[model samples]
Structure formats: C-alpha cells, structure tokens
Target: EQHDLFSGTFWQNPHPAYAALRAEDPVRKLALPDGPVWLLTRYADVREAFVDPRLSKDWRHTLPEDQRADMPATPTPMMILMDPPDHTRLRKLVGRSVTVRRMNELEPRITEIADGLLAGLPTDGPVDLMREYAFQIPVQVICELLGVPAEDRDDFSAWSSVLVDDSPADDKNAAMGKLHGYLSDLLERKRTEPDDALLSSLLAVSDEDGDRLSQEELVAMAMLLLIAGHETTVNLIGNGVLALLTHPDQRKLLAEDPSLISSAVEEFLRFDSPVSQAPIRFTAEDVTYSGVTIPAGEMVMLGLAAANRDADWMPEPDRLDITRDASGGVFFGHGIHFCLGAQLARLEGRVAIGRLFADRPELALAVGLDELVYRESTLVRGLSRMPVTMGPRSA
Candidate 1:
C-alpha cells in the first residue's frame, strides 16, 4: 500500500491502498515524488477534510511560490476548485440554471438520449460502453444544455480530454488558451442572437454593470461544464458497473430491486471513486493530526478512493450493500465546493444504466474481465473501453 497507486497501469482496479488506508491511522501522509501530502483515507475523516476551512482549494492563495504557474491552466478555476469569496461569487451566477425543478424537467430528455444510445449499442453485439454508451449520452445532454454548436463536439472532445486529464501534463495551458478563444466568440454570438439555453441565462446573469462574470470567467465556467460532463460521471457509472459485475451477488441484487441503483451508485463511488487523488489542497493556516502538523502553505492530497473503503467506517468494507450509508460517501464530494453536477450526473447514471438493462439485460463484457485496460493518471481513473458482448436478447 505504500507504493504510489497512480504511477502504473495496475491502477485501474486499486483496492489495496483503499483497503489498507481504511485501516491505517487517520491523517496518514504520503511522501509523493513532488512533496509530502497527507492522505485522509477514511470516509468520515475525508468528508471532514473537505469541510475544513483551513484546507483551502483556491490554488492562487494556497499554492507555494515554487508551484504557481503563469497561466490559469485549469479551465477557469470555477467554484469546485476555488475558495470563497471567489467561489461564492462565481457559483452564484451559474448555480441557478440547474435548479432542482430544472433538473427534474431535464430527466425525460436525458432518458430519451440514454435510451437512444442503448438502442444503438443494442446490447446484442460487441460494443465499447465507454465509447458507444458511457461517453456518448452525457455529451449530447450537456451539449444540448449549453447550446453548443453541433460541429463543436469533435473539437470539444479533444479539449475536454486534456481538461479533465490529471496527468500533470503541459497541455492544460494550451487547452485553456484555445477554450478561452472559443468561449469568447461564443459569448458574443449569444449576445447578438440569444437562445433560451443555459449560456444565454449565464449571459443575462453577467450583463450587470459590475456584477457580471468577466469574459474570462464566462469562458472558464462553460469550459468547466463541458469537460466535467465529458470526463467524470460516466467513469463513475463505468467503474461502478465493473465493480457490481465483478461481485455477481451485488450485481444480481441491484438488477432485481432497481430502486437500489442510486444507493448502489453511491456504493460504487465509495468502492472506486473516479476522482482518485484529491483535487489537491493546501493548509490555509496550520493544521495538525497524527502528531504531525501541516504548516500553512503545505500541499495536501486526500485519497478519496482510499477513504471510501476504510474498514473502520464501512463494515466488510469490500462489500457492496446499498443499505450501508456510512456518512453517505464523498464520491460526489462534500462541502460548499461539493460537485455542482451531482444531480445531473446521478440522473445520467440512473437513466443510462436503467435503459441499458431495459435494452439488453444479457449484456456482458465482450472482452474477458482480465483483459480490460485502465486509463492512467493520478487524478482520474477509468476504463479505456468496456467491450461488451450480448447473448440471446428479446427486448
């Protein structure tokens, strides 16, 4: 478990550290290659770590002088990764779009999209779920929500891939440059010829004398939504499905109850959260635990995946029982900066998986389980493709 989990291909199914850290003393720290970061591996402690005001997410304020980059390399430094009052200011302008009622209204349209994708895959032939099913549905949904041009998806895909990729890559700066350019033009277009879509509303929100999101902030928010849609949840669903299938008992149980899907989703998140490494944090002032102190400005990492499987919190930590709700898991994360797309992602999963089963229950992996490939990176963990084959189908 002391080994770096993110440095290898074996990371696709990392249960060892998740298992060990669950038992390790709280506030366990890792001596990462760059510097030391305390990995909070238990469910309760991880959530608390997220809630701690002292551990700020605003990189500019928290980052050490040596690590600061010249560019705002991340898509826009939106609320999810920002600290108040910046986070509060930015989120207020955009958070109104996906109100609970709006999300409920979006359900049918999302279902249609999910069902359509399943029909194309048919659960009868060999299909790559990550490609054919998982990634496709959300793009169509989020794109339609943003009123992105139909022609933009291909370009959007490439930009978003780098945007969500956590490889410590140099592409982010370039991606940001291109994205800002695109968003700047798009914002102008919406101004002249507005649509009743989310961007238009965002435009309206920012039209104030001084309250508006700067053009840069507008571009960043849109870019964050686009990439987040592309990168995160389907990994959640894809990874979750793999976990349930591997544990046939759990898989069968979920298939029968169906209502358990939501809880099962939570369970899957705890089992293997896609946001494997913490999104990176630094101590605001000074914080101490386990007889050690993280001085102000010191870097930190919360091993989200490790924390979920903590045996101290989750009984039979490896078991996937929807009935267990130890602090409800931080898969979607927690706190003021909790995932903005939480409801959107959950709806996508429920409809996507529900429709997949409805379309093809006999669907199983085309490739052997042992042969599947995992996406490499310290930040995001997911499959390259989920090749699935089908047996006799009646639907």
Candidate 2:
C-alpha cells in the first residue's frame, strides 16, 4: 500500500509506513506542496545525514536566491538553524549554563513539581493526563528553571502551543514575535536583577576567553529553550504513559521495580520518539544514498523516528522492552546538535512516569485504544488528550 506519509492518517501510527519505506525505498523523495524533498528512512542513512557537512543546516548556503529573500528575520540566528563555527560558538556559550551540575541541582525542584501536580489529579472518573499531569510538570519545571514569572506562564504556554501545532503561518509568526518580545524584555530585567535561574546564569556565563552571549543571542536562546524545553518533554511523558497503558506486562514490571524507570525512559524514547523528524536539512551539493542521488539545493527530511525502529539496528524493533539496551538511539538526535535539554528531559520523563505509575498503579485508559487521537505534525508525535481513570473506585 502507498502511504502519503505526510497526512494526518500517516502520523497516527507512522511505524508501518516507516517500516515499509526503510525496506522498500530507504531514499524516497516526495513531491510536497512546497516542493520536492528527499526522505531518508534507513538507520545508517539518517545517522550519517545528521552530521553530513554536505547537507547544510544553514539556509543562506542552500536556499535559492529567490526564496532566501522571503525568509523570516530573527533577532539573532537560532543555533539549531546554523552551521558551525557559529553553531559551535552559540552552543558553547549556552552550554556553559545548561550543565549536568545544573540539572542535578534542579532535580529536587522537578520532583517537587511532579509530586505537586500528581496530588492535584482528580480521584474519580476520567482525567486528561496530557493536560493535567504530563503538560503541567515540564512547563512548570522549565518555567521555574528560566525564572519566568508565574503570572506569565499561561501566556507562554499558549504561545508555545500555537507555535507547535499546525497553525497558520501568520499565527505562528505572530506567536514567534510575541515570544521574542517577552524574552527580550525578560533579558533586560535579568541584567539588572540577576538571580540563580538559567536565564540569569546565561547573562553572566562566559567562555575562557570571556566570550559571552549578547543581548540578541540571549533572547534567541531563551526562546529556543522555552519552547524546545517543554514541548518535547510534554510528548515524552504523554507518549510514555500511553505506551505503558497499552503494554500491561511492561507496566507491571515498571510498577514492580521503580529503579527501572531510568532505563524505561530510554525505551520510551526509542519506542515512540517525541520527535518524528529532525529540522529540515538542505543539500549544499549532490548527495547520494542507496544508489539514488539528490542534487544540490534540495530539501532533506531525516526520519529520526524511522531510524530508531530500523530492525537492522534493533531486534524486534517494535517491542517496548523497558530494560532493553536502548542506548545510541537518535531520538535525542546524534552528533554536534544532540539535544541540549536531553538530561533535563530524561529527569522529567523518569520522575513524571515513575511517580504517575507509583501513585496510580491501576490507571487504565478511559477510552478504547482506537479512540485515542494523536497530534498531526511532521515534526513531533504526541497525543491530543489522554483520558484515563485514576483507578477502580471502591463499590
């Protein structure tokens, strides 16, 4: 069967189509509405493409001259959209503050947030875990980490939702502008009243040569962190819970031994990655894969989700064995642009999933499996809402 691969139906459960592509046409190209773009499916090709110099992330080098003029103007270029030396420098400046030690320090607060959210979950009937629990934990954790005022969080959440959903271009641009303005103002405040938050730390952080993030860079970094930070983790928790609820034996094993939560999070990431594809890459020169050649100045979609489940790299690729050696998956991505928030994401996932199951062991889907709905986006895979009973009420 031929799959559109970009339709809402395809995203609902992309694995079957992904499996077919990996086996039949690992280097297939699709004629998208925007233009024709290559889709890399197999594990090896996607992995190589992540770090391929010929496949540039910088649009300036790859986008056609006519198209380049229409690109949106960013206050400061986002590191994710740049190629190194610029990407390397910006990553280093931001990395100075988002350290492992910092995540360690934030663990207690993350757990506190998770526990508080869990306490507030309704005891009777069905609750949308995606809204009440999964979304709440990460948003709170990331907001507090960045020192975003409690009053402003609702606005931030709204802006983030619009940016990620299949919203119109005008709406997305407006949301981006609002986020940029908010962060720009917040950066100024931090300059005068520095705190222990990550935003404040980014203000003071410098490299060995005293290189520091500029005003524009800080705003850009904050915008990236604020959105990327919570959006991905929201899915991680939501998808992880959905996976567990669907797989009873695996859920039982996790409930039996909480220590497995750490490894289980990795399995969750591999089983159903929050990110379906990396940001679109552009070919600077002719690139060939699986005997098919993609010419210069073309778009490439690296299928991170497809690669994660490729049976050549993983046996029984569809199974959700929480204890499997789930290392080396590209769910967090590979090479230089590996997720900056990876540690924090894992912390949130482990705490959120572990605590949810521990508190509500009898949690079961309030709706049938076929009734669950997934978000339709080429970038991230997540649920629209996950309704679940807290547990059976005493008769």
Candidate 3:
C-alpha cells in the first residue's frame, strides 16, 4: 500500500502507514516537497543508518547547490549535522560542561519546578497540560540551566514558535535571525563575566589553554543546546501525558508501581517519539540497504517513529504496556549523533510525569482523543495542547 507520509490521515494515526511501509518497502523513496528523499522504515535499517559511516549528516556541505535551496537555515554548525572528528570534538567540549552529574544534581530543582507549575492548576476545571505543565517545565528548566534571565524567557516562546513552525520560510528565517542576535549577545556576556551556568562553562572552554570551541562554534552550540533542549522535552512531556490519558490501563499500572516510571519513560518515547525523524542525513557514497541503492549526496530521513514500532524490535509494538521492558530504543537517537541532553531530558520527564500522576492519579482527557491538535513540523511530532481533567472526581 502506498502512503502519503504527511497527509492529514498520516498525522492523525501514522502507525498503520508505518507498519505498511516496514512490511512492504523498508527503504522507500518518499516524494517530499523538498524533492524526493529516501525514507528508512525498518528497525535494523534505521538503527544502522544512525551509525553508518557512509551516511553524511553534514547536508549543507555535501548536497549539490540545486538540492540545498529548500533546506532550512541552521544558526550554526549543529553537532547533530556533522560527521566524526568535528562531531566528536564538539561533543567532548559539551559533555564536560553539562555532565550527567550536573543534571542529576538539578533533580531537586527540576522537581521543584514541576511542583510549582502543577500547583498553579485549577482544582475545578480543565487544564491545557501543554501550556500549564509540559511546555513550561522544560523551557523553565533549560533557561535556568543556561542562566537565561527569567525576564528574557518570554521572548523565547515567540521565537521558538516561529523557528520550529512549519509555516512560511520567511517567518522561520526571521525568527532564526532574531534568535541568532540574542544568543550572540548572551554568549558574549558570559565570556566576559563567566558564571556557573552552562553557557558560562562553554565560554571558559576557550580559556582552557587553546583546546576550545571558537566564538562561532560556541554560538552554534549555545543555539543548539537552548532550542534543541527546550523543544524536544516539550514534546516528550506533552506526548507522554497524552499517552497515559489515552491508555488508562498503562496509567493505572504506572500509578500502582511508581518504580516503573523509568521504564515508562522509555515506553513513552517509543510509543510516540518526540522526534518523528532523525536529523536529515546525506549519503556520502552510493550505498545499498534493504536492496535499495541510494546515490551519493542524496538526503536521507531515518523514520525514528516508524522504527520504534517494528515488531522485529519490540513485541506487540503498537500496544502501550508499562510493564514491558522499554530498553534500547532509538528515541534519543544512536551512535555519534546521540542526544547530549538525553539524561537531562529523561530527568525532566521523570520529575514532570511522576509528580503529575502522583498529584492527580485520575488524570483523564478533557476533550475527546480526536480533539488534541499536533504541531505542524514533520521533524517533531508533539501535541500543541493537551486539555485534561486533573482528578478522578472531576473525570
């Protein structure tokens, strides 16, 4: 069966279509508006693509001029878009600055942030969890981590909306420009008066006897850390909440055995990934995978959402089961481009979801499941808002 991967139906329920592709054509040629690109659907192929040396993540440099026109502008050399050596250098610099220990240490603050936001919810009415809870928690936590003043944060919502928006090209371009200027200024400020925050730590990298990221590299990394950090977790919390509300059996399981929250977080990731596709990768040389030959410099999209649902990878892939072992999924990606913010994001999700269900064990959908609206971006699959009732009495 052929599928228009981005059709309204695809967005509404993509599982059926993904299953069809995985079974029939694992490496299908998808005719995207940006031009036709190869979409990898199977679990093995998608995971292989993530670490494949022949696949080039550096699209801007590798793609032919004619093909590059439709690509969106990136503020800097995002590590997710680079091959090894360059990618390795930046990841090391960043890992040192935002260690897992640092993120773990912030758990109290993360939980505190979740509690503060949950406290503001009305005891008697429907609440938009995306706005009141999911969206706010990550943005607040990320901004705090970066030492972005609370006053400057309101602008981020507007800027981020435009940046991730799948609307007009000019709008996204303008949004990126404003964000670029803001980050440039912020990075400079940190360079002069270094603080204890992540940004300041990055600035001090240059002070490390010449083993450091350049000013340009620093700006790009900051842009990446702030935006990628904020947007992905927004979807994780938002999507996770929706999953629990829709799957009450799983929700009940989680509520009964809170120990399952860690595994539940993994399940939530696979059930509906925050990132629908991995960052676009290009073929460095002609390669054959699953019997399809992809030419050099051709854009490739690894269907992360599709791969997660493969029965070959996980049994009863479509079913939501909190008791199931949700290990080794490609939700945080794989290989060299694995997400640097993985730990922090997971910590935030644990705090956010754990506190939420604990406070309101009977959380249920306020509107019909069909009423929830998803964001427009093909790259990020998440709810724009999730209206939910807090307590069982209210439900």
Candidate 4:
C-alpha cells in the first residue's frame, strides 16, 4: 500500500505536499515506505490532537512496551513521555530543581558562555559550527553544572554525540547501557558528596521531599536531561543559523532589527526544525480524529516539519521571514506533550542568533547549498557539521 508517499522529497521543501493534502484531505492514512502513519495536514488538527486527552503522550498502556512508537528508546525514561498522575508527580519532583530562580541565575552564566563561543569563532577560516562552536557550548554548560572534571569532557562528548546521532555502532542496547552506567555511577557519587549544581540540588533534598526521586528515577532524569536536553538545543542553534544563512534577505532583516530575532527563531523551528522524524506512538485509548478512528494501541507518527509547513497555516510557509510568527508553529508540539526544554531552547536560539549576527553581520555560507549535507537519521534531524566561513565586517 506504500506507493512512494511523496518520496518525502520535500523534507527540504514540503509545502507542495502540504498544499496538496490541505486541498484533498486534512487528515489521511499515509502508507509511507517505512510504515503507516496518519497524515494530519491541517494546522487545526495537529494542534487539537496535541491537547486531546484521547491521545496520550505516554504510549506504554496500549502497546505494552515502555518505549512509545512516537519516541525513541531513552536511557532513563523520564516523565516527558508519560501521562498524568505519574507524569505530574515525577515532573513536580524534579521541576523543583529547575526553578525560575535557578534558571535566572544560570541566564547570565549561559549568555557569558554563548558570548565566549562567539568571541572565539574563527575570524576567517572555515569553522564547523556544530563541532567547534555548537556542540561544545551546551556540553560545557551541562558539564560545568555537574562540576565534571576537565579531563572527562573529551570522553563524555564522544558518548554524548553517539547518544544524539544514534549510530549503528551505538545501537539502543549499547546506548542505553552506557548511559545507565554513567548516570548511575554519577548519581551514587553525588549522593555521597553533593556539588554546586542541579545534581546537588536534587540529591540534597530528594529523599525527604515529595515523592523522592529514587536512584533509578534520578538515573532516568539524568539520562533524559543529558541526551534529549542539550543535544536538541545544539541543533536548534546550528540549524537556526543555517536556515538564516540559507536565506540572505531574512538574515539581513534580522541583523537590521535585532528584536525580531525572537520570532525569527520560531521561523527557524518551522523551516529546519531540530527534530525531523520523531518516534511512533501508540494510542492510549480508542480515538477518532480527522475522520480516522485510531483504535487503542495503533502506532502513529507526528511529523513536526511536515505539520508546521501546512500551507493552510502559513501563507508562504516555505519562505523564511524574520517577521514570521512562530507562536503558530507546531515545532515544539502542543498540548500535554509540549517539550519541557521549550523555554531554554528559545533562550538558546535567541542568544545564539542574536549573538552571531551582532558579532559577524557578514556571517555567510562557506559551502554552496549543494555542498552542505544534513544528518538524516530517522531518529534525529540536524547537521553533523555546518561548515561556515566568516570574515571581519567590512569597514
């Protein structure tokens, strides 16, 4: 039944498909080469589905497997993938540690880290943004937060990248196994001796607090924070800049009005979102949406990039506009399953884009459009290396 459903050719440009679907059926059963998933083409349907309790962020109840088809196999399964009662409890426990006060305190430090990265950028030579700049920033911040020894970063980064990109060499078994061991060890050490970071904050009051996060839970939280957390932000920064560089006029506009860069980041999420293909999810209960009755336990895939570009939603969805309003963008996914890192990612993007332009207004694409290759892993979507060349601004 899979009749080459659009080659998904337009992953790079899916507006054509969006238009076609919008005209025909807002939602349809799509038999893609890989598998079957409901195509929710209208912006309204996608958003509605997100908030619907009929659907579940957690898919374990229907499918039996703890890992949802809509999500990848996580090392320490956090509450991000769970439904309420459970989700509410776990999130509240750990959420205490990431308080606005803590985040506000971290803000100046995060900006300083971002500034340091820009200041050290190559003044002229080719620099791989993902490597030299992007990856290092968040990893350093997290490591700095954990008070990780300088000697360990080289090794941790290798493990971290594999966790993000999901190489065949680093299959689920190995990936989860390594992370479990690392976090379990780190949490144990922290229990004995707390430090000046989130880990310390969690360890200090975890046992006496509401629903104390067990070592297993702590491991799950750590793994989730370590992997899905910072990895996505790195892509957001790198991909947002890549999208801007691809569109010169938009970049110029952003450079002209730094304030608009906020909305500009939303455009970046829609244009080349950090997540391309998310996991397949099972329905927790029988649900009817967009005329299709998805029974409990059936698999579903929510293509963020495809959904965001639905032309019915964005008039000129394909065009990158600094003025484009991203509040309408579904890149973060809406409703109960909205991303926990949403605010931080935006903060990172605003800082990243704003800084890049202010420091080097002439920031440009080093490699031609054809020369740039994107990381097309079914698990994650990003550039393994966004090689860009920048020179000092013209006098």
For each candidate in turn, the TM-score is 0.86, 0.93, 0.91, 0.84
Q: lDDT value for candidate 2?
A: 0.85
Q: After superposition, how far is residue 321 of candidate 1 from its true place, in Å?
A: 1.9
**Local distance difference test, each candidate:** 0.72, 0.85, 0.82, 0.70
lDDT of 2 by residue, 160-240 (tens): 767656658898998889989988899899989998889999999878898999898898888888778877999999999
Q: Which wins on TM-score, candidate 1 or candidate 3? A: 3
TM-score of 4: 0.84
Query: Over the stretch 345-384, how does candidate 3's per-residue lDDT look in tens digits?
Result: 9899888998898888767788987666877666788887
Note the residue pairs that clash in candidate 1: 22-310, 41-307, 366-388
Name the 10 consecutive residues with the lowest summed lDDT in model 4: 1-10
Query: What's the lDDT for candidate 1?
Result: 0.72
The regions of model 1 sitting more than 4 angstroms off are 1-4, 8-10, 31-36, 60-77, 122-125, 158-176, 206-210, 323-327
Candidate 2 local Cα displacement, residue 100, angstroms: 0.8
Candidate 3, poorest ten consecutive residues by summed lDDT: 386-395
Misplaced by over 4 Å in model 2 are 61-76, 166-171, 392-395
Error of 4 at 385 (Å): 2.9
Give candidate 4 regions above 4 Å deviation.
Answer: 1-11, 28-35, 57-76, 145-147, 169-172, 204-209, 277-279, 393-395
How many clashing pairs per prediction, in order? 3, 0, 0, 7
Top candidate on TM-score is 2
